[PDB]
Design an enzyme around this catalytic site. Sequence first.
Site, PDB file in Angstrom:
ATOM      1  N   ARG B 176       0.964  -1.239   0.154  1.00  0.00           N
ATOM      2  CA  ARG B 176      -0.077   0.080   0.094  1.00  0.00           C
ATOM      3  C   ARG B 176       1.016   1.244  -0.090  1.00  0.00           C
ATOM      4  NH1 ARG B 176      -1.022  -3.970   3.166  1.00  0.00           N
ATOM      5  NH2 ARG B 176      -0.537  -4.115   5.525  1.00  0.00           N
ATOM      6  N   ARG B 180      -2.239  10.330   3.533  1.00  0.00           N
ATOM      7  CA  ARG B 180      -3.322  10.614   4.444  1.00  0.00           C
ATOM      8  C   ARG B 180      -3.934  11.783   4.410  1.00  0.00           C
ATOM      9  NH1 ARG B 180       0.816  10.191   9.951  1.00  0.00           N
ATOM     10  NH2 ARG B 180       1.459   7.799   9.576  1.00  0.00           N
ATOM     11  N   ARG B 257      20.561  -5.488   1.145  1.00  0.00           N
ATOM     12  CA  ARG B 257      21.033  -4.125   1.256  1.00  0.00           C
ATOM     13  C   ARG B 257      21.908  -3.621   2.527  1.00  0.00           C
ATOM     14  NH1 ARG B 257      15.425  -2.422   0.776  1.00  0.00           N
ATOM     15  NH2 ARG B 257      16.244  -0.291   1.686  1.00  0.00           N
ATOM     16  N   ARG B 288      19.365  10.251   4.398  1.00  0.00           N
ATOM     17  CA  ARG B 288      18.741  10.636   5.473  1.00  0.00           C
ATOM     18  C   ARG B 288      19.924  11.107   6.466  1.00  0.00           C
ATOM     19  NH1 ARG B 288      14.617   6.127   7.782  1.00  0.00           N
ATOM     20  NH2 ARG B 288      16.859   4.782   7.956  1.00  0.00           N
ATOM     21  N   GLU B 311      23.222   8.987   6.471  1.00  0.00           N
ATOM     22  CA  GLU B 311      23.132   7.566   6.139  1.00  0.00           C
ATOM     23  C   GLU B 311      23.005   7.304   4.627  1.00  0.00           C
ATOM     24  OE1 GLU B 311      19.675   5.820   7.889  1.00  0.00           O
ATOM     25  OE2 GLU B 311      18.861   5.027   6.140  1.00  0.00           O
ATOM     26  N   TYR B 362      13.110  -8.481   7.288  1.00  0.00           N
ATOM     27  CA  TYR B 362      13.207  -7.311   7.917  1.00  0.00           C
ATOM     28  C   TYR B 362      12.304  -7.277   9.191  1.00  0.00           C
ATOM     29  CZ  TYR B 362      13.349  -2.734  10.059  1.00  0.00           C
ATOM     30  OH  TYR B 362      13.274  -1.689  10.882  1.00  0.00           O
ATOM     31  N   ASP B 364      11.325  -4.953  12.596  1.00  0.00           N
ATOM     32  CA  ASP B 364      11.262  -4.106  13.655  1.00  0.00           C
ATOM     33  C   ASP B 364      11.525  -4.851  15.065  1.00  0.00           C
ATOM     34  OD1 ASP B 364      11.013  -1.647  12.098  1.00  0.00           O
ATOM     35  OD2 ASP B 364       8.854  -1.959  12.256  1.00  0.00           O
TER      36      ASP B 364
HETATM   37  C1  LIG Z   1      19.940   0.054  10.235  1.00  0.00           C
HETATM   38  C2  LIG Z   1      18.783  -0.925  10.978  1.00  0.00           C
HETATM   39  C3  LIG Z   1      17.782   0.335  11.415  1.00  0.00           C
HETATM   40  C4  LIG Z   1      16.807  -0.421  12.282  1.00  0.00           C
HETATM   41  N1  LIG Z   1      15.667   0.839  12.814  1.00  0.00           N
HETATM   42  C5  LIG Z   1      14.783   0.425  13.653  1.00  0.00           C
HETATM   43  C6  LIG Z   1      13.787   1.117  14.184  1.00  0.00           C
HETATM   44  O1  LIG Z   1      13.710   2.276  13.894  1.00  0.00           O
HETATM   45  N2  LIG Z   1      12.580   0.543  14.834  1.00  0.00           N
HETATM   46  C7  LIG Z   1      12.641  -0.693  15.055  1.00  0.00           C
HETATM   47  O2  LIG Z   1      11.701  -1.095  15.623  1.00  0.00           O
HETATM   48  N3  LIG Z   1      13.566  -1.538  14.627  1.00  0.00           N
HETATM   49  C8  LIG Z   1      14.724  -1.203  13.921  1.00  0.00           C
HETATM   50  N4  LIG Z   1      15.739  -2.041  13.483  1.00  0.00           N
HETATM   51  C9  LIG Z   1      15.307  -3.317  13.561  1.00  0.00           C
HETATM   52  C10 LIG Z   1      16.247  -3.932  14.924  1.00  0.00           C
HETATM   53  O3  LIG Z   1      17.512  -4.168  14.897  1.00  0.00           O
HETATM   54  C11 LIG Z   1      15.809  -5.088  15.602  1.00  0.00           C
HETATM   55  O4  LIG Z   1      16.157  -5.355  17.039  1.00  0.00           O
HETATM   56  C12 LIG Z   1      16.440  -6.426  14.998  1.00  0.00           C
HETATM   57  O5  LIG Z   1      15.693  -6.428  13.582  1.00  0.00           O
HETATM   58  C13 LIG Z   1      15.729  -7.545  15.544  1.00  0.00           C
HETATM   59  O6  LIG Z   1      16.057  -8.920  15.153  1.00  0.00           O
HETATM   60  P1  LIG Z   1      17.309  -9.864  15.627  1.00  0.00           P
HETATM   61  O7  LIG Z   1      17.408  -9.920  17.060  1.00  0.00           O
HETATM   62  O8  LIG Z   1      17.214 -11.119  15.004  1.00  0.00           O
HETATM   63  O9  LIG Z   1      18.619  -9.177  14.801  1.00  0.00           O
HETATM   64  P2  LIG Z   1      20.260  -8.578  15.148  1.00  0.00           P
HETATM   65  O10 LIG Z   1      19.986  -7.421  15.804  1.00  0.00           O
HETATM   66  O11 LIG Z   1      20.943  -8.461  13.925  1.00  0.00           O
HETATM   67  O12 LIG Z   1      20.798  -9.490  16.111  1.00  0.00           O
HETATM   68  C14 LIG Z   1      21.162 -10.802  15.438  1.00  0.00           C
HETATM   69  C15 LIG Z   1      22.306 -11.114  16.149  1.00  0.00           C
HETATM   70  O13 LIG Z   1      22.993 -12.316  15.753  1.00  0.00           O
HETATM   71  C16 LIG Z   1      24.660 -11.923  15.877  1.00  0.00           C
HETATM   72  N5  LIG Z   1      25.234 -12.989  15.192  1.00  0.00           N
HETATM   73  C17 LIG Z   1      25.252 -13.258  13.513  1.00  0.00           C
HETATM   74  N6  LIG Z   1      25.953 -14.247  13.246  1.00  0.00           N
HETATM   75  C18 LIG Z   1      26.590 -14.928  14.430  1.00  0.00           C
HETATM   76  C19 LIG Z   1      27.203 -16.067  14.572  1.00  0.00           C
HETATM   77  N7  LIG Z   1      27.833 -16.810  13.804  1.00  0.00           N
HETATM   78  N8  LIG Z   1      27.565 -16.466  15.704  1.00  0.00           N
HETATM   79  C20 LIG Z   1      27.456 -15.530  17.011  1.00  0.00           C
HETATM   80  N9  LIG Z   1      26.238 -14.524  16.865  1.00  0.00           N
HETATM   81  C21 LIG Z   1      26.123 -14.247  15.651  1.00  0.00           C
HETATM   82  C22 LIG Z   1      24.828 -10.876  15.287  1.00  0.00           C
HETATM   83  O14 LIG Z   1      26.301 -10.367  15.528  1.00  0.00           O
HETATM   84  C23 LIG Z   1      23.634 -10.085  15.841  1.00  0.00           C
HETATM   85  O15 LIG Z   1      24.208  -9.447  17.141  1.00  0.00           O
HETATM   86  C24 LIG Z   1      16.698  -1.601  12.524  1.00  0.00           C
HETATM   87  C25 LIG Z   1      17.492  -2.580  12.042  1.00  0.00           C
HETATM   88  C26 LIG Z   1      18.763  -2.083  11.296  1.00  0.00           C
HETATM   89  C27 LIG Z   1      19.892  -2.992  10.627  1.00  0.00           C
END
Ligand SMILES: Cc1cc2nc3c(=O)[nH]c(=O)nc-3n(C[C@H](O)[C@H](O)[C@H](O)COP(=O)(O)OP(=O)(O)OC[C@H]3O[C@@H](n4cnc5c(N)ncnc54)[C@H](O)[C@@H]3O)c2cc1C
Lengths: 391, 392
Positions: B176, B180, B257, B288, B311, B362, B364
Amino acid sequence: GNFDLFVVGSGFFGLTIAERAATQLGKRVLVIERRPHIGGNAYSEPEPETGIEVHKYGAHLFHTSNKRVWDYVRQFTDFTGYQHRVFAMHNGQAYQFPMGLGLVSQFFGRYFSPDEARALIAEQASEIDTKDAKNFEEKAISLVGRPLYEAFIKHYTAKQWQTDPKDLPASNITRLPVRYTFDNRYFNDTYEGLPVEGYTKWLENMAADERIEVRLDTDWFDVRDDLRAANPDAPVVYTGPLDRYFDYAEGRLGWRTLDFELEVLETGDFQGTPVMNYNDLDVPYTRIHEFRHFHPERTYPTDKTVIMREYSRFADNDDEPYYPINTEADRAVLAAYRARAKAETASAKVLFGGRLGTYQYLDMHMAIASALSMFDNVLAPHLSEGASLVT
Amino acid sequence: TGNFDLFVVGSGFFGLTIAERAATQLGKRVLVIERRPHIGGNAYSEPEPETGIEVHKYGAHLFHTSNKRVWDYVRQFTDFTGYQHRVFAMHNGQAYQFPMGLGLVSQFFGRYFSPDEARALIAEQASEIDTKDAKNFEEKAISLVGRPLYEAFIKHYTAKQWQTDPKDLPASNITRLPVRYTFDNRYFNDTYEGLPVEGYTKWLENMAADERIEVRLDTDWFDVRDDLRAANPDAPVVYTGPLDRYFDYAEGRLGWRTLDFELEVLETGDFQGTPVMNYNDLDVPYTRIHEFRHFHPERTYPTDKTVIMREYSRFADNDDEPYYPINTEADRAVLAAYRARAKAETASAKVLFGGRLGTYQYLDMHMAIASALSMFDNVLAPHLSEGASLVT
Ligand SMILES: Cc1cc2nc3c(=O)[nH]c(=O)nc-3n(C[C@H](O)[C@H](O)[C@H](O)COP(=O)(O)OP(=O)(O)OC[C@H]3O[C@@H](n4cnc5c(N)ncnc54)[C@H](O)[C@@H]3O)c2cc1C
Ligand SMILES: Cc1cc2nc3c(=O)[nH]c(=O)nc-3n(C[C@H](O)[C@H](O)[C@H](O)COP(=O)(O)OP(=O)(O)OC[C@H]3O[C@@H](n4cnc5c(N)ncnc54)[C@H](O)[C@@H]3O)c2cc1C
Ligand SMILES: O=c1ccn([C@@H]2O[C@H](COP(=O)(O)OP(=O)(O)O)[C@@H](O)[C@H]2O)c(=O)[nH]1
């Protein structure tokens, strides 16, 4: 029936006093209200066709940085997370408002950074320092600069006051935030929101104690002599207009009053925002209220809406006063009425409070803080220790 | 110490939600293995040295949710400010109210449009292209918001985000694209939002605080797993690292990306008067600019300095941190192959795959937390508590 206290007027000042005396001291309170409804200008009611809650005297937004007031009012109502924002219609365009990077970029037609905006406004305001400003016009120009003054302040002020800006209070303009950020909140206080169940429910909750009696459709000046005769120890808190109390003996204070046109429209949304100011001379109203936007959580129709056009004029002898004007001439007449008020406190145990009772430009939270102070520091000791009202 | 009941790979919000729930709700011993020198994944925050201002060096993080269970859960670990996210957009030298709404529409088209006239204007412009006939991202965007708003605020921003002509992006990319028809510019529509009062890193540390959670930093799972699992053979593994790396890229490499950031301290107290400014035009290379002092107005920050962060977006090459899945058709095929491998691995090795990297999605913060709570309720907790099968 016996009463320990008379309160004239059932707006937030009067009801704060009434509630405090009733609950904190167990006193019998009679509240005398000349209008057919409770609550003064804060009164709300549903529009019959849509069921949308309307603020009968135009939008009322609650805001305060006084934690003691915030704690107090939350005893009578919950609050929504609403934060007030106002847009300004000027030459066919809707502007971010009040003073901030939004207004500046829109009006001057390109982006100004905080430092660029500060520099721009400083030059445009240079004819006067905010320190030195003697009146509304000078203070306003010193804060927003002459071009923005001429576009968004001058003619709105002319419509609302019909009074030379050089003879209006400087404090009128400092009601509005002045910012060099993209923040466009209309207020700058710690707490704000709308009462979840509306203003009238909040007000009725304040008068709920069984020791409180409210008599509507009753003019104090018609009933006071017999009431006081039957309860001669009871003091009075008066919140009606100050000059009227003394039969205009010291002259007439200048007041503004308002007329409204309420209209139900066959669209779900008229302007997409609660309050739109109209800052140009070419429309008669100062602003339009669209009340559905105050309570998105409610069961409101999707194909109809209620709006209200607000018009300002001088309070005649027939009208009920809404705003003190406080020109230099008004202030001299005020000084005379303050002398009269203090004499009446000493002689007849009548206290004076509120927007009307003190001829002050008071918001809800200001009125409530003032009433809490009056109760704790002046009225309660009189009622419970027989302390003097002449402090 | 040791005698682990559970291995968690990765200490982002997904992994730490899993670890904390297993530890406090089931009394299980958890080892969290993290390859980075800190916990929290990309949500990790830290003070910029010169200003003391808290920054998010892996990208700006704004928390929001509409799920009250998730809200009540995260409030065990942090308080939240009353911050509401708002974004502005820079286009041809003017700052616009954003997202697309009556504010932007009025500014851009040069006069006030009411809800009804804005609706009619957008419908008319959108009618240039029937959405069903849209052959790509660009045509579909136009078919939804009209050519002027697309070409002003979507076209080149998208081009900088994906490093690709939007004419070459699939119409599928767009679910979508609302305009607004009110002046509401609260960026998120979610019920609950705010920033953690003591910052993200403190929040994350509180999630990892239970004594039954042990964390090993600077440690790659693939270096340590064989002997750790031999010593603790029936502990399951919740893996939140990259899905393709897990299987030695045997089915191909998933496309992502990445973002580059440039942090800069400026000798002014305020650079842009707002937390985030989008740059919609092709004449600046960044998408940004973040100004972190505005993330925490309630704090006493320096009156004469500020830190901003530019960024930049591009394809993630092999040494880059993966941020957003590209999801080409080729990617989705590679993903399907790994999904099959993952299901087989859950069956034979008791490894669950979760989080952003583990699922090629992706997420949040609140999405990741909700996903982990769901994995816990439906799959992992019944397994740990009752010996239930992990295969679903
Ligand atoms: C630029 C960016 C901006 C973002 N902005 C927002 C926002 O504004 N609001 C929002 O709600 N969310 C945002 N997010 C999402 C946020 O980071 C979430 O907390 C995340 O996506 C949660 O998912 P995750 O815990 O699986 O990912 P991750 O935070 O990536 O955690 C995965 C972990 O696994 C570790 N890992 C990977 N491979 C291995 C390995 N072989 N051995 C040991 N450790 C390993 C990594 O080092 C990492 O620490 C953003 C994410 C990014 C990348
Ligand atoms: C147009 C308008 C808009 C406003 N908007 C806001 C806002 O957005 N936010 C905010 O915080 N505040 C707002 N206010 C202020 C608010 O309405 C009240 O003025 C404030 O709550 C102070 O209350 P009060 O008790 O002092 O006066 P009032 O509300 O005026 O109550 C005084 C009462 O005394 C009654 N009375 C007068 N004479 C007699 C008599 N002889 N006998 C018996 N009863 C009598 C009157 O009928 C009235 O009910 C607004 C006020 C006005 C007029
Ligand atoms: O668009 C606006 C809003 C306010 N004001 C001036 O600021 C004063 C206080 O504004 P407020 O919004 O506080 O007025 P109220 O809601 O109390 O009528 C008004 O009387 C005007 O003189 C103005 O000139 N233009």
